[PDB]
Amino acid sequence: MNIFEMLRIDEGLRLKIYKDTEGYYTIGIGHLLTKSPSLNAAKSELDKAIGRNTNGVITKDEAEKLFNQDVDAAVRGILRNAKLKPVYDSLDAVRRAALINMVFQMGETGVAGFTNSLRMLQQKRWDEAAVNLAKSRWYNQTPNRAKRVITTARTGTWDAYK
Ligand SMILES: [Cl-]
Ligand SMILES: [Cl-]
Ligand SMILES: [Xe]
Ligand SMILES: [Xe]
Structure with a gap:
């Protein structure tokens, strides 16, 4: 067990934009996209994060990539x-x-x-x-x-x- 597995458990995995516990637009392994109520906005945010016109869907790897960056930023935020x-x-x-x-x-x-x-x-x-x-x-x-x-x-x- 480790941080990756742990968080993959708690957050789950979703390939299409979804809404979190708080009603927010999120995708992948708990990758928050925006606090705004706009699906387009979430879409904008998604495409900019991924580097392509996703239409609201991403692949597994794409999800894993964001996750990697999210975990990395989490540690670093701690450390700073x-x-x-x-x-x-x-x-x-x-x-x-x-x-x-x-x-x-x-x-x-x-x-x-x-x-x-x-x-x-x-x-x-x-x-x-x-x-x-x-x-x-x-x-x-x-x-x-x-x-x-x-x-x-x-x-x-x-x-x-x-
Ligand atoms: Cl609960
Ligand atoms: Cl990003
Ligand atoms: Xe903790
Ligand atoms: Xe804490």
């Missing part, structure tokens, strides 16, 4: 963020993966605001962090995925994804 980096560097490998998933899902800024959990995670206070992570809108909107991620963060194992 003053509040995130220290926590991450302090964690073991499985737990890092949890932080990456979340960042990928809610953006850096958003995760960067979980002050309190960030601190608890940095102190290796697993259970507390976990309880704290659960007091969030994140958790109330997508609890099944949130539960998987939190378990991972808490235990440092992949049990939630096996």
